[PDB]
Write a protein that binds this ligand. Structure first.
Ligand SMILES: O=C(COc1ccccc1P(=O)(O)O)Nc1cccc(Cl)c1
Ligand SMILES: O=C(COc1ccccc1P(=O)(O)O)Nc1cccc(Cl)c1
Ligand SMILES: [Cl-]
Ligand SMILES: [Cl-]
Ligand SMILES: [Cl-]
Ligand SMILES: [Cl-]
Ligand SMILES: [Mg+2]
Ligand SMILES: [Mg+2]
Ligand SMILES: [Mg+2]
Ligand SMILES: [Mg+2]
Ligand SMILES: [Mg+2]
Ligand SMILES: [Mg+2]
Ligand SMILES: [Mg+2]
Ligand SMILES: [Mg+2]
Ligand SMILES: [Mg+2]
Ligand SMILES: [Mg+2]
Lengths: 231, 231
């Protein structure tokens, strides 16, 4: 539906939608911009990420509420709780599949710089992770391994190509630690990764401007917040 | 799309959607329930109202953000702000027209008890009021008069048939005062209505149980909050 709108108009409208807190519209505008086929700038990658993280965040919150009610039900109240949890689940899967589709066609393959490639691979890890949260069985196993593989490729590039305080490197490590703790049943791997990431960023802070220091220390606090939750 | 689902399943899912904060789904489930053609109970009227008030509330908040940006623009940045404000405006009008359609087909005509009839006429006033907020010109005049007429019929019934502390009577008076202040350019009528409503409810509080007292005084505080904003 966005095929007739200029790329620059799609970007401008995504920024308007963000101001209006209209995140579904924001995601649709950014999907349209990606589908123009040009690479995204740093600012545009961030719009894409913010839009979808807010859309999927709404669905994840709802899915948790409904899953909890369903689990409690398990007086008979009929199929309705399961049906509606499934509806929300299907819509959530559809959003994840859309994002993964954009990454595969063709954002990741054209991303040559470390900052873009790590950003997109982290996104690939995150959206497979959201799929894993609602998956069951071995179906679940291949999804978990897809998330793992994407995060691992991102980490390998980030460690070779970015400083330990780079915010995208920090955010990737934070989310991969969350993957280990919440999805992969590997709380020790989670704690080790978050601690090493934190310590290596601390040792690099002296190299940063006031503004970069603020950006890095904000994400380090998130790693610290998790380490406090986990230990 | 809800034609194949049982009425009771639609109601149950509306309550689930409210818990999950999925207000668009909640409105769709309640629209489906109304379209079954049976009258709504007090609890079901309240679900219908909560659902649509949240949906339209999101649109009104967005429309205000975009209208403000548009008015500021009036460097040339092209048609995009106007286009996107119009998109949001159209969707908002569509929601209002949907609610008004449900009231006209056939909720109001089958509502014989005071509590149902006043509730639906208040809703008719509110949704024409939301249409008036985005309307221009004389188009605007007939919309304002539709809101007025609906509120006036509701007030006439409420004054004849309900005690001055009845929460629906109180809410109707609050919203009609807001209509006078914000839409009809009649701040004196707004202040007079809110003050008389407040004073007449205060004099009736002695007749109420602890629980009814809590329900009434909560809405009286809203009338007081507006009177403080307006004087
Ligand atoms: O509360 C959280 C915290 O999740 C994180 C914490 C640190 C890094 C990354 C995440 P996330 O990508 O799972 O959102 N996420 C969340 C976000 C939106 C909806 C719901 Cl239900 C949960
Ligand atoms: O802030 C308000 C206050 O409006 C009222 C105050 C007292 C009674 C009735 C109303 P409302 O029916 O205009 O929401 N409403 C509002 C509700 C949702 C979105 C936006 Cl932008 C505004
Ligand atoms: Cl459903
Ligand atoms: Cl490449
Ligand atoms: Cl638009
Ligand atoms: Cl009747
Ligand atoms: Mg072009
Ligand atoms: Mg049932
Ligand atoms: Mg399923
Ligand atoms: Mg390239
Ligand atoms: Mg480098
Ligand atoms: Mg039936
Ligand atoms: Mg422009
Ligand atoms: Mg218009
Ligand atoms: Mg009747
Ligand atoms: Mg009576």
């Amino acid at each position: 539906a966005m095929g007739s709108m200029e790329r620059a108009s799609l970007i401008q409208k995504a920024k308007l939608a963000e101001q209006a807190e209209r995140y579904e519209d924001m995601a649709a505008f950014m999907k349209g911009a990606v589908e123009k086929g040009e690479e995204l700038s740093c600012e545009e990658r961030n719009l894409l990420s913010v839009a979808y993280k807010n859309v999927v965040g709404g669905q994840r919150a709802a899915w948790r509420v409904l899953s909890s009610i369903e689990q409690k039900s398990n007086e008979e109240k009929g199929p309705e709780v399961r049906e509606y949890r499934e509806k929300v689940e299907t819509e959530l899967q559809g959003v994840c599949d859309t994002v993964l589709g954009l990454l595969d066609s063709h954002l990741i393959k054209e991303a040559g710089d470390a900052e873009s490639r790590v950003f997109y691979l982290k996104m690939k890890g995150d959206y497979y992770r959201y799929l894993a949260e609602v998956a069951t069985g071995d179906d679940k196993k291949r999804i978990i391994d897809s998330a793992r593989s994407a995060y691992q490729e991102a980490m390998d590039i980030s460690k070779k190509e970015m400083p330990p305080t780079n915010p995208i490197r920090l955010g990737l490590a934070l989310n991969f630690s969350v993957f280990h703790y919440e999805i992969a049943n590997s709380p020790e791997e989670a704690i080790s990764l978050a601690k090493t990431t934190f310590d290596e960023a601390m040792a690099d802070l002296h190299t940063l401007s006031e503004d970069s220091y603020k950006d890095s220390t904000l994400i380090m606090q998130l790693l610290r917040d998790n380490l406090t939750l986990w230990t």
